[PDB]
Amino acid sequence: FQGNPCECPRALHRVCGSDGNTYSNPCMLTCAKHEGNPDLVQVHEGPCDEHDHDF
Secondary structure (H helix, E strand, C coil): CCCCCCCCCCCCCCEECCCCCEECCHHHHHHHHHHHCCCCCCCECCCCCCCCCCC
16 A cells, blocks of 8 residues: 555646545545545545645
Protein backbone atom coordinates (compact mmCIF):
# COMPACT_ATOMS: atom_id res chain seq x y z
CA PHE A 1 0.00 0.00 0.00
CA GLN A 2 2.19 2.69 -1.51
CA GLY A 3 2.51 3.99 -5.12
CA ASN A 4 -0.26 1.65 -6.40
CA PRO A 5 -3.09 3.77 -4.78
CA CYS A 6 -1.34 7.20 -5.02
CA GLU A 7 -0.01 8.42 -8.39
CA CYS A 8 -2.37 11.37 -9.15
CA PRO A 9 -1.08 14.92 -9.65
CA ARG A 10 -0.67 17.69 -7.07
CA ALA A 11 -4.02 19.13 -8.22
CA LEU A 12 -5.35 21.49 -5.47
CA HIS A 13 -8.85 20.00 -5.99
CA ARG A 14 -9.62 20.21 -2.23
CA VAL A 15 -12.40 17.81 -1.00
CA CYS A 16 -13.85 16.28 2.18
CA GLY A 17 -13.82 12.75 3.61
CA SER A 18 -16.52 11.36 5.96
CA ASP A 19 -14.78 12.70 9.10
CA GLY A 20 -15.25 16.26 7.72
CA ASN A 21 -11.49 15.83 7.10
CA THR A 22 -10.45 17.88 4.05
CA TYR A 23 -8.15 16.19 1.45
CA SER A 24 -5.89 17.99 -1.08
CA ASN A 25 -7.73 16.02 -3.84
CA PRO A 26 -10.27 13.12 -4.08
CA CYS A 27 -7.51 11.07 -5.77
CA MET A 28 -5.50 11.06 -2.52
CA LEU A 29 -8.74 10.03 -0.69
CA THR A 30 -9.42 6.92 -2.81
CA CYS A 31 -5.64 6.30 -2.75
CA ALA A 32 -5.56 6.51 1.08
CA LYS A 33 -8.73 4.41 1.19
CA HIS A 34 -7.29 1.55 -0.91
CA GLU A 35 -3.91 2.14 0.80
CA GLY A 36 -4.83 1.80 4.49
CA ASN A 37 -8.14 3.64 5.15
CA PRO A 38 -10.96 1.06 4.55
CA ASP A 39 -13.17 3.32 6.79
CA LEU A 40 -12.71 6.34 4.49
CA VAL A 41 -15.37 6.80 1.81
CA GLN A 42 -16.02 9.36 -0.95
CA VAL A 43 -18.82 11.05 1.01
CA HIS A 44 -18.82 13.81 -1.69
CA GLU A 45 -16.26 16.27 -3.20
CA GLY A 46 -15.73 19.92 -2.14
CA PRO A 47 -13.90 20.86 1.10
CA CYS A 48 -15.74 20.70 4.47
CA ASP A 49 -13.34 23.10 6.23
CA GLU A 50 -13.50 26.82 5.21
CA HIS A 51 -10.15 27.04 3.34
CA ASP A 52 -7.43 25.62 5.71
CA HIS A 53 -6.93 22.78 8.29
CA ASP A 54 -6.36 24.53 11.65
CA PHE A 55 -8.09 26.74 14.29
